[PDB]
RNA sequence: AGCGUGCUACUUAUACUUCACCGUGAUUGCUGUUUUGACGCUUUCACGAGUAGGCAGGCGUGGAGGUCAGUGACGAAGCCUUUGCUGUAAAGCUGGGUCGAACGGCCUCUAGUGCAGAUCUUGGUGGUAGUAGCAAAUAUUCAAAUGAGAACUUUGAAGACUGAAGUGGGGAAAGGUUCCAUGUCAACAGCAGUUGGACAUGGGUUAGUCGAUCCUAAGAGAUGGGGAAGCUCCGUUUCAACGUGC
RNA sequence: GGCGAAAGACUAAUCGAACCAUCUAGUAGCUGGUUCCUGCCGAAGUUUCCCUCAGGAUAGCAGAAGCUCGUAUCAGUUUUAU
RNA sequence: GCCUAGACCGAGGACUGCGGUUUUUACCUAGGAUGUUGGCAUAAUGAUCUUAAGUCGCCCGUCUUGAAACACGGACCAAGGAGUCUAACGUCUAUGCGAGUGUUUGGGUGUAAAACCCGUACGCGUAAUGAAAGUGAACGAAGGUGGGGGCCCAUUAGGGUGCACCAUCGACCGAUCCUGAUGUGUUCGGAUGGAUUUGAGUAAGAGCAUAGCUGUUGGGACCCGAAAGAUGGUGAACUAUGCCUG
RNA sequence: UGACCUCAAAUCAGGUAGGACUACCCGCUGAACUUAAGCAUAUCAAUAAGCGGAGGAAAAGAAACCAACAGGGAUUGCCUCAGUAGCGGCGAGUGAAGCGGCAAAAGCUCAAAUUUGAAAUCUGGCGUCUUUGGCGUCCGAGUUGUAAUUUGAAGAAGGUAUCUUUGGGCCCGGCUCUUGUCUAUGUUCCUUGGAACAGGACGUCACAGAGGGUGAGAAUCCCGUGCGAUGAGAUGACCCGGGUCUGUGUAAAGUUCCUUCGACGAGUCGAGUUGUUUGGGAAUGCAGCUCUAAGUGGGUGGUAAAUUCCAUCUAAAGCUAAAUAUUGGCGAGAGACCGAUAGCGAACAAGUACAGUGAUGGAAAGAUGAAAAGAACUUUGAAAAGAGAGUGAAAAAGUACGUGAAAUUGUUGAAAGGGAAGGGCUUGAGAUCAGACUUGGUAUUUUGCAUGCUGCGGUUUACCGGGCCAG
């Protein structure tokens, strides 16, 4: 708010003894503003309690390694069909994830051709989902340049841009991203894992140089992909295994019988 | 006002500090405009480099002796050793410093070698030069083409040679000699004048 | 999406530029599409509506009506067609105001400036 | 976030957690470190002894660069040897050829003598060493070479 | 049906006993039947007062990312209502009426986020109450005219008063069109109104001789100068080569 | 500051120091208020110091988070001995 | 031991148990209600609203030892209305990396305040102690003793090994005090051995960074509230006093 | 009879200054509230108010610097140094600098020198021309010093081996800025609606699915958006690329070495004292007064003094872009901001109406409808109005205009009521609401379907069993 809002008055308290509250009041006469309360957060025309300041903290620091951790986790989550489906993507007619497309799609220059390729590879039902999802935003945010809302479509990741970025620019919901610069705002929109990612072959083959492997060092300086604290992530087979089940005592009833 | 087992703080906020709060909202905007200024400056004078050649100098003080960094300009003696006048040097991308001198040979030799390396890659155009030759050149980054390079620390294998006096004893004796130099010299002067004045 | 830094996506700025548009600016805003016959005759798809054009109403309660434009009433952002009248219980008739984007031009009023405008826009006039 | 604060939970309760008798006030007790010798003596004496008074001599215009002398102990000295060549050096080091460790070039002023060295000759270049650090270096067959 | 004393029965607390249900704490068991909930299900026992205060789990509001390819001009939101349902509750959902353009559920983010009070703020509305009151300045009445309408307008007749230090006839200050004619009654004239200093439309102020203008008064104040960091202060012919001379 | 045949009178309904704006959201150990639900736990008015006595700090009382363990050796009680 | 009158309740939901009778691998009263009959389903039944009757019930908020108080605020209603943000911090928690850690001053890059990338320095940590000159952390399996979860060997017990941590006696580094070797710019050096002394130390590192709650200090600082103080201006149309002209 | 010096006058010829704005900038002057739990030093604060002066930036700036190193190297800003050294009733508090990483980088000008074989310099008048000016000429300024030459990094004067570099004016381009013109695809069908811009079907364009308008949520109706293309105007000693005309280059400048020299700022430095200020502490800067220099001298080297050294600069004269600041002006783009008691005081004829002698103080107030289609006409009334009618999708939109809450009020209906009313619990009464003959199953007949009898409402008596209330 303005630094002087509510404080452009010469108001002075009347003091006690005049049967009115001790709030400051406008002086003078001849206008209806005269004698009216001022300066108070409870007063009409006063300044708000604790007026908002610009030196509030707006940007937040995140450790670079943790940010990379989360980016890798989101990329990994993009290959889990259950996560992509819970994420809301119409991916039921894609035969396997990750969806990798040939490099000719890096060279499409017309939106018609890019849409045709999206239709061919089975990624256009999610574009149709974006098209059908357009609604007027609820609330005053529509007065602030945010008039419509819609879903997110597929994310197309390339290695070389020979026209694909501009060809997909106008398709609603589709985002394009270089494999060299992938971030969490695209990989996990809304902090929800499982983005529907369409890789070109070049981007898929560059992933291993970008993030490294057990045989390849990452281009990122001193960076290694994270290690899990658990090796077998399926604990039902760990519990119901020969090694563990051979040393346990026999199980009781799932529910104790009531004896009294 | 003072309560609990807490550190005692020094929060200097008793003046009208809120009238002098500079929040750098324009960090990204200034970064972008700074880059645009840099492109305009480069494109104006291409293929001439945007950076003048800078010398390499030791950083001062006992804390930064080990480090070596870019200086401000080459000394008059250094330019003299490569046969360049300072007035001329300023016009071919070489920086001059009339204030710095060369007490020692090491920095002087490093900067003479640096000037000779830059001078070998220099190509000065003239009227007879056509735009075909000028377009055959790319605008290099002098700060990267002639970087400031730290001398490598000594490492590897060498023969062990053990002096009889330990290093700790050497340091202690140096400290003691410095501490008592003045009083010992005064004592010796008094002794000499006494034993050579009455011995007249 | 817009790319130029000189283009504004502000709703308030766009509406202010519309309702405070000068009369000269309102001429372009009150453009009308040509009919299919004139579009192939002149190879131009829309023109600023002019006083003596003939239009066909394609939207609203007067859809299907035809007539000659009587006035481009630029202050009200409307055109008044020849016989598109509403009859008050008084017995008097007031013209019905129609936006030019809700009609098609079926016959152009031509002069030396209209022809140059059509030829400027890549079309063919005479 | 404000929605997690106890201000949201105090809504509806009269005193906002400040008490009906105490009545949260402007500055009871003073501002800042007021009354440190009078009514906050019991706090400063208990938790900050040594607070009042002068100790030692002043130093006009103290330049901290003069006193720069980072320490490295002996148990950390072989980390300055190249990692790719440490294992070869730990085997083939002798009096005729021992690794040189330039401690100043790595940012250290004094070599201290905590810990144990590998029983392997080394040449340690330092501005300063402690008495025991140099005794331990000589015992493994090494030497300390003073530099500046 | 009092006093002292003894006895039998009977009366009833949120207390005690048995039982149901809620919650809290502990506790039993649950993966070759773990079986799409193990932050889950399940056995058993005990316990439950509370200001100041602490903590936990939830309800609600504005806006943000995501999702429901959610609701909606065949009616969103809002509002009224013994239409009810759900929850210990904060509240959520729903029938009918009204209405007219947006709005919600869920996973998260965020905050200018919840009112009965502060002689709180601004706006609005009551009881009081058709009440206090509309009582100084002697005093009005008859008739006609006008008008829808006359205690109050106009005219006539009368009765009165101010009583020339006036309730008369002019002016200075101050106001500014209130002046005059015509029309005119929504508001204003604390009743009324056809009347008005109200409202609307027009008209109207004529100078050589009346004033201003000119003179100087107490005083105000440039210049030449002298102070003052300076805004400016002093000084008024002043330590001045002072005539736009006749 | 003025002015006062003097009353602290008068200086624009303002006078034992006018009015206006700003510093200024001046400071207040003092008065008043401080906005949803349920669940669990639950006080103090006492010690010492303080120009301290309507206030603080300190210790106590209270909550929360737990941690190390699993009957180890504790108790606002009795007995016996002293 | 036996007979006999009444009231309230019916949690649970295949089996599993303990008993009993055994005519029996069956039955029972024995780990919680079944059987049967009538009526009703336009209704007997239940809930809410209004009202009557019986019984109880003082006006909320506040300060207070004590309020329904003859203590204070509150006529009524709507809308607004009070622990916020920031700099620097303590504890705790989550997360990443870990003897390191922190990309974001800046450079690169960009689909352009985003995302992505880069590294030198620097901050904190990895060494303390002394006023300072200065000096600077292993006798030993990084010590001994008593406990100590877990693990190993056993076979109640018992033995071995015992991290974290607790109590205790030592060792090492710095300061203080004492002693004072070979030596020497003869006044320096300080080996060696000690001391009811002392440090926020060593004794196989634990930190750094981001975020959240709570607490702290400075800021308007939960909201509203002085009497005052200062700086710069405006008034002698009232009034006080002098003067000039009536 | 004339010079010169000093000082005047003119409506003399030609110029220049004042005042405004406020966000940032350069100075002067200068508080107190406040904190210290009192208060006077201190703090607030070298801040507010007051005064003088600028610009697009200002200021500072090419060391009388920092240092103590193996040395850096004009100024400015950022990060850090560092809440540190220090200052402080050593209390409350306060508080820089060097180094280091980076942004940006750019250097120089006078005075002091004899042109002395030639005042070589310049304002002005007059004339003329191709006019931000050139040329010619004449007065004047100026020797009490205007040009050339040098600025300490040097440099001068002689000698010296020769070598290397180069002036100006126009014309078209490019760059920069502004601006004009030009551009893809449905208004196809059905339903609702007053209106399609809604839903459904079939599509199209997309380097354009930003935004706005149009009778409701419109990429495809319109303007735009995106992509570029092409004109016009400007601008630039101090941007470059070409041309083109003159270059009067025995000239100007630099480069190597030798010799002789090498002018370098005074009421200033410095010292004392006083006041203020600073972190600056036997005194950091500034200022007043008193004293008052020197020439390897002078300053600095954060503890006063004398003696001896060392290090490092070179004051008392001057200019200079960029990085830096920016609640003002101008032009733009935005936002997890506010949504008419909010947001600026002001969304409106708002610094308006209105108040005050004055300085000053200072509001309230947005929304019919797509469109006035703003109700013709008849009738009652003095009129305002009313009643019919009419327009409209709606008058449950009539300008006393969207929705239209509460307080408060009228009418109708229901009920209750002996000096309050209101509440809880319980039941009665009245009103309302709810629920199992279940999605009940068993065979049965007829009424109805597009159809070829088949899913299945329909009916009553039978039987199975169920629900609820009870004995
Ligand atoms: Mg406001
Ligand atoms: Mg302190
Ligand atoms: Mg030097
Ligand atoms: Mg409570
Ligand atoms: Mg309350
Ligand atoms: Mg509390
Ligand atoms: Mg209170
Ligand atoms: Mg008390
Ligand atoms: Mg308290
Ligand atoms: Mg009795
Ligand atoms: Mg008795
Ligand atoms: Mg009970
Ligand atoms: Mg309780
Ligand atoms: Mg908000
Ligand atoms: Mg829909
Ligand atoms: Mg309804
Ligand atoms: Mg509705
Ligand atoms: Mg509407
Ligand atoms: Mg949503
Ligand atoms: Mg609020
Ligand atoms: Mg209220
Ligand atoms: Mg009121
Ligand atoms: Mg009233
Ligand atoms: Mg009466
Ligand atoms: Mg009276
Ligand atoms: Mg009469
Ligand atoms: Mg009389
Ligand atoms: Mg009149
Ligand atoms: Mg009246
Ligand atoms: Mg009347
Ligand atoms: Mg009038
Ligand atoms: Mg006269
Ligand atoms: Mg006259
Ligand atoms: Mg006079
Ligand atoms: Mg004067
Ligand atoms: Mg008196
Ligand atoms: Mg008065
Ligand atoms: Mg306040
Ligand atoms: Mg008190
Ligand atoms: Mg309890
Ligand atoms: Mg005391
Ligand atoms: Mg009290
Ligand atoms: Mg049961
Ligand atoms: Mg009672
Ligand atoms: Mg009270
Ligand atoms: Mg009392
Ligand atoms: Mg009470
Ligand atoms: Mg009483
Ligand atoms: Mg009282
Ligand atoms: Mg009171
Ligand atoms: Mg009252
Ligand atoms: Mg409210
Ligand atoms: Mg580091
Ligand atoms: Mg450190
Ligand atoms: Mg030290
Ligand atoms: Mg340790
Ligand atoms: Mg106040
Ligand atoms: Mg005051
Ligand atoms: Mg005072
Ligand atoms: Mg007067
Ligand atoms: Mg003149
Ligand atoms: Mg001025
Ligand atoms: Mg001051
Ligand atoms: Mg203050
Ligand atoms: Mg004080
Ligand atoms: Mg106080
Ligand atoms: Mg005081
Ligand atoms: Mg100060
Ligand atoms: Mg000021
Ligand atoms: Mg200007
Ligand atoms: Mg600039
Ligand atoms: Mg300048
Ligand atoms: Mg110089
Ligand atoms: Mg510098
Ligand atoms: Mg200060
Ligand atoms: Mg630097
Ligand atoms: Mg001339
Ligand atoms: Mg177009
Ligand atoms: Mg629209
Ligand atoms: Mg459609
Ligand atoms: Mg649109
Ligand atoms: Mg000089
Ligand atoms: Mg001063
Ligand atoms: Mg001084
Ligand atoms: Mg002095
Ligand atoms: Mg100078
Ligand atoms: Mg300057
Ligand atoms: Mg800015
Ligand atoms: Mg600006
Ligand atoms: Mg805006
Ligand atoms: Mg407003
Ligand atoms: Mg307002
Ligand atoms: Mg309205
Ligand atoms: Mg009539
Ligand atoms: Mg309607
Ligand atoms: Mg309506
Ligand atoms: Mg209405
Ligand atoms: Mg009502
Ligand atoms: Mg009665
Ligand atoms: Mg009842
Ligand atoms: Mg009933």
């Amino acid at each position: 708010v303005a630094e002087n809002a509510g404080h452009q008055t010469s108001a002075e308290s009347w003091g006690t003894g005049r049967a009115v509250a001790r709030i400051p009041r406008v002086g003078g006469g001849g206008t209806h503003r005269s004698g009216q309360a001022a300066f108070g957060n409870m007063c009409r025309g006063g300044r708000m309690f604790a007026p908002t300041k610009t030196w509030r903290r707006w940007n937040v620091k995140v450790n670079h390694n943790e940010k990379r951790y989360a980016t890798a986790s989101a990329i990994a989550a993009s290959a889990v069909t259950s996560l992509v489906l819970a994420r809301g993507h119409r991916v039921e007619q894609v035969k396997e994830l990750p969806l990798v497309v040939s490099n000719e799609f890096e060279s499409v220059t017309k939106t018609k051709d890019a849409v045709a390729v999206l239709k061919a590879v089975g990624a256009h039902k999610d574009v149709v989902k974006v098209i059908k999802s357009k609604k007027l935003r609820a609330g005053k945010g529509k007065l602030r340049g945010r008039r419509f809302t819609q879903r997110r479509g597929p994310l197309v990741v390339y290695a070389q841009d020979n026209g694909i970025v501009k060809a997909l620019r106008n398709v609603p919901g589709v985002e394009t991203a270089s494999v060299k610069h992938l971030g969490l705002l695209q990989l996990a929109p809304g902090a929800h894992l499982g983005r529907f990612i369409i890789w070109t072959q070049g981007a898929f083959e560059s992933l291993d140089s970008v993030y490294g492997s057990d045989s390849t060092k990452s281009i990122k300086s001193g960076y290694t992909l994270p290690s899990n604290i658990i090796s077998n992530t399926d604990v039902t087979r760990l519990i119901n295994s020969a090694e563990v089940q051979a040393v346990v005592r026999p199980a009781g009833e799932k529910t104790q019988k009531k004896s009294h | 006002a003072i309560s609990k087992n807490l550190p005692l703080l020094n929060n200097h906020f008793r003046k009208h500090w809120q009238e002098r709060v500079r929040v750098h909202f324009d960090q990204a905007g200034k970064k972008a405009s700074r880059r645009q200024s840099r492109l305009r400056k480069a494109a104006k004078i291409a293929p001439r480099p945007i950076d003048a050649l800078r010398p390499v100098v030791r950083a001062p003080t006992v804390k930064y002796n080990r480090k070596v960094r870019a200086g401000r300009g080459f000394t008059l003696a250094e330019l003299k050793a490569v046969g360049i006048a300072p007035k001329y040097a300023r016009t071919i991308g070489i920086s001059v410093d009339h204030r710095r001198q060369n007490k020692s040979q090491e920095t002087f030799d490093a900067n003479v070698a640096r000037l000779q390396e830059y001078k070998s890659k220099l190509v000065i155009f003239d009227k007879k030069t056509k735009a075909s030759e000028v377009a055959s050149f790319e605008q290099v980054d002098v700060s990267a083409t002639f970087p400031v390079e730290q001398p490598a620390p000594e490492s590897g294998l060498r023969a062990v040679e053990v002096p009889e006096q330990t290093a700790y004893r050497t340091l202690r004796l140096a400290r003691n000699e410095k501490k008592y130099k003045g009083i010992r010299e005064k004592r010796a002067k008094e002794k000499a004048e006494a034993e050579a004045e009455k011995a007249k | 999406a817009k790319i130029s830094q000189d283009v504004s996506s502000s709703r308030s700025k766009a509406r202010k530029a519309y309702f405070t548009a000068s009369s000269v600016e309102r001429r372009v805003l009150l453009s009308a599409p040509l009919s299919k016959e004139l579009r192939q005759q002149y190879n131009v798809k829309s023109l600023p509506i002019r006083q003596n054009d003939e239009v066909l109403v394609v939207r609203g309660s007067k859809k299907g009506s035809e007539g000659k434009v009587n006035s481009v009433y630029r202050l009200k952002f409307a055109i008044q067609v020849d016989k598109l009248q509403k009859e008050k219980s008084n017995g008097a008739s007031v013209p019905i105001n129609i936006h030019p984007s809700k009609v098609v031009i079926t016959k152009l009023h031509l002069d030396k400036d209209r022809k140059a405008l059509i030829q400027r826009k890549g079309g063919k006039a005479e | 976030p404000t929605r997690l604060t106890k201000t949201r939970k105090h809504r509806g309760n009269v005193s906002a957690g400040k008490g009906r008798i105490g009545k949260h006030r402007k500055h009871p007790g003073g501002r800042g470190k007021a009354g440190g010798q009078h009514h906050h003596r019991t706090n400063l004496d208990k938790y900050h002894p040594g607070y009042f008074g002068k100790v030692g001599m002043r130093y006009f215009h103290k330049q901290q660069n003069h006193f720069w002398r980072p320490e490295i102990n002996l148990d950390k000295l072989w980390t300055l040897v190249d990692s790719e060549k440490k294992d070869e050096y730990l085997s083939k080091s002798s009096a005729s050829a021992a690794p040189v460790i330039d401690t100043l070039a790595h940012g250290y002023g004094k070599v201290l003598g905590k810990g144990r060295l590998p029983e392997v000759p080394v040449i340690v270049k330092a501005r300063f060493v402690s008495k025991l650090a140099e005794e331990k270096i000589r015992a493994v067959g090494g030497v300390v070479e003073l530099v500046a």
Side-chain angles (χ1 to χ4, degrees), chain B residues 108-132:
Chain B
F108 171 85
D109 281 323
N111 284 317
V112 167
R114 186 175 177 87
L115 279 165
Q116 272 158 5
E117 183 179 1
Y118 173 93
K119 200 180 177 182
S120 71
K121 302 182 175 178
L122 198 66
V123 165
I124 310 163
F125 307 134
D126 55 313
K127 292 181 181 180
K128 318 289 197 292
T129 300
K130 52 194 58 59
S132 302

Side-chain angles (χ1 to χ4, degrees), chain C residues 2 28 32 50 58 64 74 88 95 98-99 109 119 123 126:
Chain C
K2 66 92 175 180
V28 171
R50 190 182 185 275
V58 296
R74 296 181 180 166
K88 291 153 51 83
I98 299 189
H99 204 259
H109 171 277
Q119 293 178 356
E126 77 165 8

